[PDB]
Amino acid sequence: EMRILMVGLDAAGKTTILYKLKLGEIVTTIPTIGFNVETVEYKNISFTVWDVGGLDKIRPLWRHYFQNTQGLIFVVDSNDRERVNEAREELMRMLAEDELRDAVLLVFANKQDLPNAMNAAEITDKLGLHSLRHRNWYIQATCATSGDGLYEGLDWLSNQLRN
Amino acid sequence: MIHFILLFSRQGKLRLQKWYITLPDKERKKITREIVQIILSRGHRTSSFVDWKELKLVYKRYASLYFCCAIENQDNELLTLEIVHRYVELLDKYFGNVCELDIIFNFEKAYFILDEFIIGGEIQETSKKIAVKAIEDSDMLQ
Amino acid sequence: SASAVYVLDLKGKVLICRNYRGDVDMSEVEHFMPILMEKEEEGMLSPILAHGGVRFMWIKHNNLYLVATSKKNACVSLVFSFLYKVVQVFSEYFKELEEESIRDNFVIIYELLDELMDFGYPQTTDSKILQEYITQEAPRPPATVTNAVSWRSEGIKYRKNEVFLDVIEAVNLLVSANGNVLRSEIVGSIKMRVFLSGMPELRLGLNDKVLFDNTGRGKSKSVELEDVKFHQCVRLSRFENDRTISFIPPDGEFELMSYRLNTHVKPLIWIESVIEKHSHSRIEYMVKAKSQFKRRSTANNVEIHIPVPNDADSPKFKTTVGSVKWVPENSEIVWSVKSFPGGKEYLMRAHFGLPSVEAEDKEGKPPISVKFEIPYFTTSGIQVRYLKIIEKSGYQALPWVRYITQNGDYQLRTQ
Amino acid sequence: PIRLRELIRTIRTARTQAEEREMIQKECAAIRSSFREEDNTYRCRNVAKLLYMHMLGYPAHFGQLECLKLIASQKFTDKRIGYLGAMLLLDERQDVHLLMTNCIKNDLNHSTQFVQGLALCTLGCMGSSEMCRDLAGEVEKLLKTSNSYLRKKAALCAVHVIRKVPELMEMFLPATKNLLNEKNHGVLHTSVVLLTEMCERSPDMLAHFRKLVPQLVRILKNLIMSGYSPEHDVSGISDPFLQVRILRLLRILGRNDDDSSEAMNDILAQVATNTETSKNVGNAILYETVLTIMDIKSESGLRVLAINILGRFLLNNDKNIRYVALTSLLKTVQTDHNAVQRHRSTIVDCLKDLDVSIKRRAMELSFALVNGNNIRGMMKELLYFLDSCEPEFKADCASGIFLAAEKYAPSKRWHIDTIMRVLTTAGSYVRDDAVPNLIQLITNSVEMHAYTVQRLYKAILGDYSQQPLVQVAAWCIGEYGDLLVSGQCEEEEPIQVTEDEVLDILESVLISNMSTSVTRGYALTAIMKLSTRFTCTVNRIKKVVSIYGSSIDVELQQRAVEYNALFKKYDHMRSALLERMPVME
Amino acid sequence: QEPELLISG
Amino acid sequence: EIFELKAELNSDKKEKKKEAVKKVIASMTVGKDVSALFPDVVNCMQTDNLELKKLVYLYLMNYAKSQPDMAIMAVNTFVKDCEDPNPLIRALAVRTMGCIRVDKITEYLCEPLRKCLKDEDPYVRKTAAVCVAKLHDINAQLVEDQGFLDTLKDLISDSNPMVVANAVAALSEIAESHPSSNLLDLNPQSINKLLTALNECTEWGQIFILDCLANYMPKDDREAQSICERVTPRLSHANSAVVLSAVKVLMKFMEMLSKDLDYYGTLLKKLAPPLVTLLSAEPELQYVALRNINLIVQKRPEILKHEMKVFFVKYNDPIYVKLEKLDIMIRLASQANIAQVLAELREYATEVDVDFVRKAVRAIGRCAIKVEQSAERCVSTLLDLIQTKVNYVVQEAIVVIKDIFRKYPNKYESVIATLCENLDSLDEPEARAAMIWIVGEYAERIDNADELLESFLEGFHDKSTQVQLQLLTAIVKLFLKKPTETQELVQQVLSLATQDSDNPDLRDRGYIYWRLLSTDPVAAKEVVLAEKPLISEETDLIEPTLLDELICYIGTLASVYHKPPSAFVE
Ligand SMILES: Nc1nc2c(ncn2[C@@H]2O[C@H](COP(=O)(O)OP(=O)(O)OP(=O)(O)O)[C@@H](O)[C@H]2O)c(=O)[nH]1
Ligand SMILES: [Mg+2]
């Protein structure tokens, strides 16, 4: 019984993560100009996950999915170094809105297959999650190809139901 | 190209509006109100075509409900009358002796009849049986 | 001078028709409606519409249009006073004036419209003496149609002789968005219910400031009325001469007085609303209402109408005293308390939800209007000192008085 | 949530527009509260009730995301109401409509052809320029399918993509290979609409698509000798929309090419003679046939057959057919100019007809049929039509009189007389941008200036309520007062022009509130220009310039302040800067 | 009036 | 339907005769032509029933002008129930026979009018008084021949004051219908007897008597004071038309009273609370009283000079009330209330009623023009209205700020810098020309004037006409204010207004500017930047010869339209 918003930059892992959580295999994903919504069930609650694409014409339109969202998933790309600052400004622009102010934050450090891809702690220092005030956040290192860390992010999201 | 299709009554209130051109809502309501007053400020012997902003407006009365279409200055006005008549015949073949009340209470079904007949301002299905048959299979498709 | 008086509907067809002078062509009523929509389109809607040389002076009731025509320079204040007067005459002749009541009562409406106006000139407009000789169930005309006392008939008797006085105050308030009062006035009304026999001569005694200063007792409590409006029965010349409210009253219910004064006292119910509006997310209302009258008084059925956005949704209400419900028909919330004692301050919290897509047009800001009513209470300080009832037969009648303070145009502007 | 039929009944039980608006807002509140709780079951009926609300003319901006949610669901009825709601609510300028490109692209690869045709219908109806770029390859892969139901909608999607983004037009080239060889007439109709869309859009493929002209001729051939069918048939003739679209495509090709017109000319003669004319459908086919014949370079013997068929369209008693004949004779004016002129008595007979559209196309056909032979002969009837009309037609009538007398003037004196006649009779209906053309033709009339200046002076001396007339007249008086007056330096014999009342009536149009604050500037510049050309009156132009130097009109005040400064300090320099100019073209 | 057949027959 | 009703109406028995007449009245009331049934309902006219007589009278009232040559057959029945002992039927017959507006029967009904102007019953006497005016409007020559005007003048002097009130209304109607020969003017004894009849008549008869007093002119000072002292108690009546007619008499009559005595000041102080409480009425009377108050404060501004907060508009006021209340707030504005007026006008521009918002912005400008000491407060109010970034508010605020700047050009140059970057792609040509005039007039402190004016010239031949003239004037003024960087910018503008321009007034202005700049820039500096004098402001105040006549029409359509009554009659 969670409304989950998947956001993040383009070419990143969001649609692959959504159809790994929903179906369970790797599908060929085009860059989604619109959005994808699938409902998954794991420890018997319905995660209605809203994957919205991350091109430059969809990032003003991210704010139409901020309402009633109980948890944010911000999939980041660890392979590129010049776009993690753009992901930082996108995350700080997104988290400063009055809509989506009680939503918890999940950061997926996706695309970790080759050792130029950075790790979760140093991408936390680049994203500035330690300078977040009154925000419940968590970051773990995932890969969408084998689907490791995704269910641990999902059960952190399920663990953060209890208040 | 048909730019828009309007359906309205003797009281001037709108029954159906489909627009194949992009223009804002204030201009939409203003154009619709002045076009309804232009049609309703005309008699029953007044040649069924008005000129309006280099677009000939083809209209035809059938009951208290009016039917209207707006085409460019390259189309046929009498074939636009036949297009209006084919849409009325498709409403006949779907509902069965259609009145204004079927349009009022099934505006979305009349919208589906217009979408199975005209997309983009142009005719997609010329015939009568194929469009009604496609609506019947989409109705039992659910 | 109205040439013809029409009663219409919302479509504008003629419900009932009456010709007085004939200088306006009678088929010009169908030009009244499209002139009305084309003047409503430009924002140039006026009570006096023109069609060449024919002027349409119209009023609008709850269901009907009452239009008067003229070809010349008509006394338009007389025309509008006549139109509201026959609205009042039809409202006492029937239960309520609607579209339906014209059709079954058309014979008596035709007789009334013949009686009320003759050749553009109003003649007999009192319903109580108008019901004496034209009825829905005809004799000689009474003397009171043409007598000096045109409001009260001779020969009416009562077993118990009683006068009921209702001194009704209506507090009008307009404050700014900053919270400073820019308009605070009291419009009063003495509604009198007269059940008396014969030809009584009534003398109303009030604590007038001008009367008390002219007498020499002007040290006690008195009200300084800025303007006084009186009924037809009141002797205005002797009111001007020695501040005397002397009148032979009409039979039944009538409004004797409507006074007006400005007060520098604090408003009776004070509203402070701070709006925590967030764009595309939510709007929050923090409304505190305090009663600034005395603690022994109690305002009953106060309704604090606070406007909300038209696209708002899912209201959450926190209140201390009363109940607050959403009225989206008026695009507002009202906060209904049943009893508001003086000196008490109550709190209300309201939270809505807003769409992520903005509306195409701007909304506008209506003010906060409250709808209080304080019985056994006057705020100006006017008291009825006496009511001398003088009749040639000689009896002892009982004048009963009560004092109600209610809202008028009690508005508080928002941000 | 209440049903859509109950909401429609509750709307129909209202008595007034205000109470209707209260119950609209009361239903919209519950619909928005159901939207906030994210209810999946009644979102379809809530969006449908909001669509009825938006049809009645009420705000429905809060239902666009729910239309996207209905599109993104798996139920067909939810998809149907969501795609209809997308078509009714979103457009190109709504900017939420970009968020369903992925949803339309997912529905285009659906297993259900009705879901696929729903997405094709929504994309071809209202796809923006941004949606048509990343979905054109998805449209083109449905243009090669064997399903006719998807094929006709993909062809009209290709029409919409080409109409929206015309630089994605070359990528539909191999999708139209052997596309006219299909047998079903809806797919054939949409293919013909697609081919005439690219042929009208670009001329580089006209000879490329002219090799299927005999294929179109053969399709029209078996369409005409298809005698009776119980499908594609209304009023006895078969496939009228397909026949009219095929004849429109055959009008589009062959208008400048000869051999396609020889390949098309025989079936144009066969359609123009062997189809019935007793019905509106056959009249539509004959009108598109005569438009095709008089647009292509056809045979001159059957050009006379087109004359005869337009004649029997003209003396048809039906007003629709008379409108059609007037519109077709307006469509062919530049070709067969000898062959349009014999219907002029019939054209001016329907000029006095009671119908608005009949007299409008009759006026435009008479203006297009004005030439240099008996221009006076149509000109008295055109001024009669100007003087005897309901006054919505006077602006277009005066404008057409202006281009007719500009183009086909035999003499300048007649041109000056007819422009004075239409200026005095039309007056306030004269468009204000024609005043530079009137001043330009008057200044080009070099051999006569005094007569037109005297006629403008006599016209204003009657009345000056007509703003373009006084705007022409003030400029002409201020430029040519030196020959409006002649030899009047002192007092002489009584002549009707005596150099005072011209400045008095210029003062009158300056002082009067029945001026549009441009003709006041024309009159002030006229009075200043008259100071050089008048040698009799002094110290009157100066004081009427001086009292206008404190005006509330800022351009008038600036002009009068500059002219007062020139009068006070630089009075010897005014002839160097207030002289006449050479003409322009 | 509104419950009347749209086609002319 | 017609023949069956004709046969049922041509029957004998009374209740179905009454039902046939009732349904023929009902079929007229639903609005169909039923005038072919005329002699069947006209034949049942002398009845003992009075409801039936009233309905047949109503049919004869609205169906005799359509059939004039055949409605002659009711006159003997009319004169036979003009002599019955029931005065209700007598006055009903007189009232109905005055309403038959055909010409050839009015000579046949002068004898029952002469009988009913004379009888002892005041109901039929006051009906016959109005019937004299009805017959005068039909045939004034026949009424003058029969001599009904002399006995209508005799009905001013009798008792029972509704008879004298109806005779006053009828004689006033005949007096304005006359060609103003042989006037019906009245002595001061008649004035005194009319003022005593004013106290004991009905509330509409008070309006008729006070309308007769609005044509009187008093001959001295104490007579005018006595008539004012007897009229002034009518200001406390609940009828707004009685109040407005008394206001009409008092505003006409204090102009003959001299200002030295103390009655003029008390009349000024006591005329103001009826005018203030006129705004608490119904909205139609509110609109009529607002236009009359607009007429009143132009003549006597000292009446309502301290009562200004009653003219502040409310949200539930109608638009005709609000647009006139803004005019009263303009006409009553001063230094003592201009801060409250500016605070109210700042609120009024935040509304959604568009024409009310532009009227409020123009009212801010009119307040800056009228009150000199509040012009910087108005300018800062308009800058805060500009900063709200609403399109019509901004595009009225540049024109209003420019109209302030033409009046006070001395020390308001500090706001041009924040004025010059305020979304200058606005589409209104009036705001465009105002912003261009501000740029060209104050082109000494604008450092980006050329780089804002160069991007404005791309649609020069297709924008407007006044914008082109102001653009040429502003660019010429900028050039000869600073000729360093503007030499290549004025040359393309002179070529753009001379060579490829088609407009002849713009070509005249461009040729005059080009010839002046080619002849002498030293002379051009003195010509173009000449010292512009103080602007003669236009007057919203009516001229006093029209204003004295418009005070004589208070409560009328002339008072609403602010025009003479001859300017809108047809
Ligand atoms: N090596 C590697 N590549 C991945 C992984 N997840 C996704 N990708 C790549 O990402 C490509 C698709 O782009 P994504 O970034 O996944 O798309 P998105 O996250 O939905 O964002 P949008 O493109 O804006 O819709 C796929 O072709 C994959 O090759 C991963 O875990 N490891
Ligand atoms: Mg992906």
Side-chain angles (χ1 to χ4, degrees), chain C residues 314-361:
Chain C
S314 280
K316 301 295 144 212
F317 295 129
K318 310 138 215 84
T319 199
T320 60
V321 152
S323 71
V324 34
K325 95 209 167 281
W326 190 20
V327 189
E329 313 93 68
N330 310 131
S331 156
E332 73 185 1
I333 48 175
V334 337
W335 180 17
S336 304
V337 327
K338 268 288 308 212
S339 99
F340 216 136
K344 323 274 297 301
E345 181 174 358
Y346 300 138
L347 263 305
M348 193 265 285
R349 240 165 252 278
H351 161 261
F352 281 83
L354 289 186
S356 38
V357 180
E358 286 269 335
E360 277 165 358
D361 37 28

Side-chain angles (χ1 to χ4, degrees), chain D residues 173-193:
Chain D
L173 256 298
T176 73
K177 280 328 118 176
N178 64 273
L179 187 67
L180 276 192
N181 292 104
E182 314 290 323
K183 252 54 200 144
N184 71 298
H185 300 153
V187 150
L188 214 54
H189 187 276
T190 53
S191 167
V192 158
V193 165

Side-chain angles (χ1 to χ4, degrees), chain A residues 3 30 32-37 50 52 57-58 61 64-65 67-68, chain D residues 36 38 65 68-69 72 95-96 98-99 101-103 105-106 130 134:
Chain A
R3 190 183 194 273
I30 40 160
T32 90
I33 320 287
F35 73 105
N36 303 297
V37 41
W50 297 84
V52 195
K57 26 152 180 194
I58 321 159
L61 307 178
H64 300 89
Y65 302 82
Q67 317 247 21
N68 319 323
Chain D
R36 198 43 78 108
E38 272 179 291
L65 290 329
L68 301 190
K69 286 151 121 190
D95 68 52
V96 157
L98 176 291
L99 292 154
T101 316
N102 185 64
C103 284
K105 209 171 306 154
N106 284 335
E130 257 292 323
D134 43 356

Side-chain angles (χ1 to χ4, degrees), chain A residues 12-16 29-30:
Chain A
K14 309 180 291 266
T15 324
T16 330
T29 60
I30 40 160

Side-chain angles (χ1 to χ4, degrees), chain C residues 105-336:
Chain C
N105 291 127
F106 73 104
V107 168
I108 205 183
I109 280 174
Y110 271 133
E111 288 188 358
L112 271 172
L113 279 180
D114 180 80
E115 197 66 38
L116 282 150
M117 166 153 307
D118 199 16
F119 201 54
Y121 298 122
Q123 302 291 314
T124 315
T125 41
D126 297 304
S127 326
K128 187 74 59 149
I129 77 88
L130 219 38
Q131 265 146 0
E132 280 182 66
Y133 62 102
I134 74 150
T135 65
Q136 37 266 88
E137 47 97 25
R140 336 257 312 187
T144 167
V145 179
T146 195
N147 268 350
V149 184
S150 57
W151 47 88
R152 173 64 169 261
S153 281
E154 324 206 319
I156 43 188
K157 286 270 312 162
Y158 282 102
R159 305 121 308 290
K160 211 197 308 143
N161 286 346
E162 283 168 327
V163 190
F164 295 96
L165 256 77
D166 291 71
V167 188
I168 299 170
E169 313 264 43
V171 188
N172 296 23
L173 186 87
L174 184 51
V175 318
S176 76
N178 334 314
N180 49 267
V181 180
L182 54 103
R183 163 148 215 83
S184 184
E185 85 163 339
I186 306 175
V187 279
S189 182
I190 304 195
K191 308 268 212 312
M192 276 190 27
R193 202 145 87 259
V194 170
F195 302 119
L196 290 182
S197 302
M199 274 304 121
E201 226 278 341
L202 259 68
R203 287 262 284 106
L204 188 70
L206 299 187
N207 46 323
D208 206 349
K209 182 62 155 38
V210 192
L211 170 69
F212 274 14
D213 289 346
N214 283 2
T215 302
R217 67 187 122 176
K219 195 254 305 172
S220 60
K221 164 93 209 132
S222 59
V223 283
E224 201 215 301
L225 321 164
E226 314 215 330
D227 204 65
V228 194
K229 248 61 218 188
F230 278 121
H231 207 247
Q232 170 63 33
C233 59
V234 193
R235 304 291 101 219
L236 296 175
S237 67
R238 86 176 317 212
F239 173 69
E240 184 105 343
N241 175 72
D242 51 297
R243 221 78 178 162
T244 293
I245 309 164
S246 176
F247 60 98
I248 296 156
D251 190 45
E253 220 295 323
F254 79 108
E255 193 217 33
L256 175 86
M257 216 175 152
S258 98
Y259 53 93
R260 191 246 303 165
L261 72 141
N262 273 298
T263 44
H264 320 337
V265 82
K266 70 216 305 205
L268 293 173
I269 290 191
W270 186 249
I271 312 292
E272 302 122 287
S273 90
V274 44
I275 322 294
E276 201 209 281
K277 159 82 148 272
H278 292 275
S279 213
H280 324 120
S281 176
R282 71 212 172 105
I283 191 175
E284 288 258 0
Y285 287 84
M286 201 321 293
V287 182
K288 30 171 65 177
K290 45 206 302 277
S291 46
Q292 324 201 257
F293 43 86
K294 34 179 193 221
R295 343 197 58 102
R296 333 176 289 82
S297 286
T298 292
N300 308 310
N301 318 307
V302 349
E303 300 186 321
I304 307 167
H305 294 246
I306 296 142
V308 304
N310 201 21
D311 40 9
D313 54 88
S314 280
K316 301 295 144 212
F317 295 129
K318 310 138 215 84
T319 199
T320 60
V321 152
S323 71
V324 34
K325 95 209 167 281
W326 190 20
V327 189
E329 313 93 68
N330 310 131
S331 156
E332 73 185 1
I333 48 175
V334 337
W335 180 17
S336 304

Side-chain angles (χ1 to χ4, degrees), chain F residues 420 439-440 442-457 471 474-493:
Chain F
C420 265
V439 159
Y442 298 109
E444 291 137 337
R445 70 222 75 254
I446 313 173
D447 281 17
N448 48 344
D450 287 86
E451 318 59 21
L452 62 94
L453 273 178
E454 270 263 32
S455 182
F456 202 111
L457 291 168
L471 250 184
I475 284 175
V476 152
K477 273 201 256 154
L478 152 72
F479 162 69
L480 85 167
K481 264 159 186 170
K482 44 230 200 173
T484 57
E485 70 269 69
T486 53
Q487 251 286 341
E488 83 264 21
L489 179 270
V490 80
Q491 268 323 291
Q492 89 155 88
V493 159

Side-chain angles (χ1 to χ4, degrees), chain D residues 261-273:
Chain D
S261 303
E262 321 217 7
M264 168 210 294
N265 165 89
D266 312 60
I267 191 95
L268 264 180
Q270 204 259 359
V271 163
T273 38

